[PDB]
C-alpha cells in the first residue's frame, strides 16, 4: 500500500484546478475593438466609402 | 414663397455680424456698393435697389436628396441620435 502514501490528488486534478479558465490574450482586446471601431469609422467618418451623413442628413440641392 | 415679394436694398443689412465674413454696404439713393470680404477672397460690385427686386422673381425651391425619402431619413437620424 505505498500508493496511499502519495498524493491522492492527481497530476490531471492539479493541472484542471491551476489551469481552470483558459486565459485572455492581450490581443484578443485590440481585434475585437478595431473591428467593431472600424465600423464607427465606416458609418460616421465624412472620409468613408459609406457615410451614414447623407442618410440620415439628407442634402439640400 | 409668392409670385411678388417686396424686400431689397430697403431696411437692409448693412453689415455683418461675424467675423468670419466681412460685409460692408454702402447705400445711395439708387444704387449700393456693397464689399464682402470672406477668408482671403474680396468682391465689391454694385447692386440697384431695382436688381435685388429681381432676385426673388424666378424662386430657387430647395428639395432634399435624399436616400430613400425624407421621412426616412427622419426615422433613422433619431436611430442614430
Known amino acids: 500500500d505505498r500508493v496511499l502514501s502519495l498524493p491522492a490528488v492527481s497530476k490531471n ?3 484542471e484546478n491551476v489551469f481552470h479558465t483558459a486565459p485572455k490574450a492581450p490581443v484578443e482586446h485590440l481585434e475585437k475593438m478595431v473591428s467593431a471601431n472600424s465600423k464607427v469609422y465606416d458609418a460616421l467618418n465624412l472620409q468613408s466609402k459609406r457615410v451614414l451623413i447623407w442618410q440620415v ?5 | 414663397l409668392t409670385t411678388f415679394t417686396f424686400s431689397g ?14 460685409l460692408n454696404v454702402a447705400a445711395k439713393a439708387g444704387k449700393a456698393e456693397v464689399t464682402v470680404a470672406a477668408g482671403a477672397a ?8 431695382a436688381a435685388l427686386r429681381k432676385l426673388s422673381g424666378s ?6 436628396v435624399a436616400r430613400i425619402s425624407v421621412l426616412h431619413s427622419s426615422i433613422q ?4 441620435s
Do not use: H, R
Request: hydrophobic share 50%.
Open chain 2, 9 to 22: 436694398l430697403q431696411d437692409a443689412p448693412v453689415a455683418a455680424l461675424s467675423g468670419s465674413i466681412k
Open chain 2, 42 to 49: 474680396k468682391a465689391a460690385t454694385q447692386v440697384s435697389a
Open chain 2, 59 to 64: 424662386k430657387i425651391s430647395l428639395a432634399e
Open chain 1, 57 to 61: 442628413k439628407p442634402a439640400l440641392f
Open chain 2, 77 to 80: 437620424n433619431y436611430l442614430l
Open chain 1, 13 to 15: 486534478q492539479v493541472l
